[PDB]
Amino acid sequence: SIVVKNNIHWVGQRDWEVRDFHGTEYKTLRGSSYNSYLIREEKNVLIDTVKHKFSREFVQNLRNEIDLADIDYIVINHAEEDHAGALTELMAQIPDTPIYCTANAIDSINGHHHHPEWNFNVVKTGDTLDIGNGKQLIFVETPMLHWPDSMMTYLTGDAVLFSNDAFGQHYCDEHLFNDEVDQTELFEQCQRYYANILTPFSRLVTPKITEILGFNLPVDMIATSHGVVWRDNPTQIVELYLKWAADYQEDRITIFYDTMYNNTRMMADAIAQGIAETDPRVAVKIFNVARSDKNEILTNVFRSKGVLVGTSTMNNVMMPKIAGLVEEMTGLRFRNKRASAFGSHGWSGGAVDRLSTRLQDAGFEMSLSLKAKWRPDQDALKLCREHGREIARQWALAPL
């Protein structure tokens, strides 16, 4: 175990191998960690557990740190399998130990573990739990961030905020603190995490953070459930969340597509050239959805002021990977972004109009579409390049 601060001990699990989260919809290219914490004052408190995969290691490591019978309280901020997965294994040894969680958490814990006989203690925002030596735990409900059962736990005196998923990231390292790891990799994983997970709940992020700041509680460290512990200027991740929640966008345009014979690809490249020669201020990224990392694309969309999506017509409908990605964007609910559909067809086409409608359903402000027949010749590529010019001028943040 590792000492976080004073009597706070890290008893979590590092995961160097993990590459698949949420089935296969979140790629963790730099692994992850599942942070669990043991506070040892007059009372002994365990905050969260780990993924069920590492349940046998978690309990064994916990035994080496403390006698299981000496654990007074267990706090579950979040009952997702990556934090409450080892709960059944633990409660098998100490079935009488009280569990402090939200009312919604009782539903989610019982939903996964099927042990309603456990001793649950419903907490709400403002409720306190004394652990001795002048210190206490303060609970703050954070529903739909990102689950109905989500909450945070604040420790007085030591001034440590256990925020669980919030402000966390999928980044594995032997070092525990934020000032001990590579800043670029840390930032990338942080923004990747928010873009793919917390984007649809951005409207709830700002008022909740404002509420927490209203409590006037000092924060020396922010102990998340994923990745590093923020100790050096810990509120930097809070400020990033405030910026990211305000319908974040840079002067950036993301282009992604799928293709069978590279006809749509040639259209995408021509559009990009038109943009770059019209507005040098705009950053342009191009991805083939069949050949690229899906979560990297979505992170770029989150950063972009607008997107262009390409697809060829196949059996009167759009390419499936495009349809799948559009469905996902419909759930992430991006705001204040614009979009334009394009692609090639053989005869009757129809997939571009179909795509344009579904992008509109996803919440994008739609511009005119761009269509081409078979492989674009020099004249057709001019039209594609002209489309990029028209898009650049329309989506301009500032004149010229």
Next chain:
Amino acid sequence: SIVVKNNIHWVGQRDWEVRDFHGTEYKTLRGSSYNSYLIREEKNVLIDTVKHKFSREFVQNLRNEIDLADIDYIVINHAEEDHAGALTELMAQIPDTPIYCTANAIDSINGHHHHPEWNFNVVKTGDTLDIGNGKQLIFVETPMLHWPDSMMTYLTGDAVLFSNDAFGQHYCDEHLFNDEVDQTELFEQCQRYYANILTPFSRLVTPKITEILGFNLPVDMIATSHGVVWRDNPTQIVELYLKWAADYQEDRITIFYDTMYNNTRMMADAIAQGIAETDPRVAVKIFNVARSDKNEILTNVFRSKGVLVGTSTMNNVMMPKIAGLVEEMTGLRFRNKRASAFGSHGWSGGAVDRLSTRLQDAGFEMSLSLKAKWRPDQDALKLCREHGREIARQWALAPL
């Protein structure tokens, strides 16, 4: 080159490495071949070419077989890149050589190659082309099988039908004839080809085959553009096409799903058990779309009387791989099939109803949906197993 029959020579290209067709939407697990044919009578006729990738090999191999200036006519049954890709390379050496094709083919050839100055000869069904020695070519238009430009070429005397894509399959082997290869692998690739490509055009297959048979033309061999040449009982593939075109279905049910925490998976397994214990006549297949071959799933759907599709609710919508697969099935237009949606959710759900609607849009006759909250307990698994019973009884081809 290989002698097909008399003066008919195979001058195509084998592709052992190929794994991706139509972008990445068709996996060729056993490679493929691109069959081109050179007929040498009084006139010399080249039928189709090969993929553009092998253009330099194709021309060089063609030179070794015959002087390029001695080629009288070029026949293009189909202008898709895997058959007409090496055309520009060839016409650069012999620009005056006439091209015989459909009216729609002029649009598709020029669409890919941008050389409208080529000498095109529009042919329609019934048109003939004498090549000497009492032999001639007879052209038969096959629009939307699978392209608007598609046609077949029949050679009199030798009685060889050049059917291009039709009756072909993606199967690579050193041996050229159907009686020289593994029958099981051949059948599998044949059915895989029809299910993923020709299913939406099944209504056109039967009348077209009926029309061809009406011509009373003898067929000794069927030389496709993909895979083996049918010489031993060559009409067996024609009969399979007739069976497959009649809204083909066996006593079979396909179940596929995507999941994040295996909750939906446990539902799928319970449903299967309920079916198998209710109707022993039914064959059941289960696939995880994120972990399985997409084209194998679709081949099973083609063979199935009905399907069950599972998904969890993620950001109020369905899993993207499921959305993508449903979009593709909407294009394949399966007929006379039934479906049932299922899956797990956390709180409000909604993805199952969303999926049920889109399956209905895909043409499936929808039965009642099955829903569960979090991880199904013993009581919930009974309900899932009961759902399988209800489905089995409803979809029964015969009583009991």
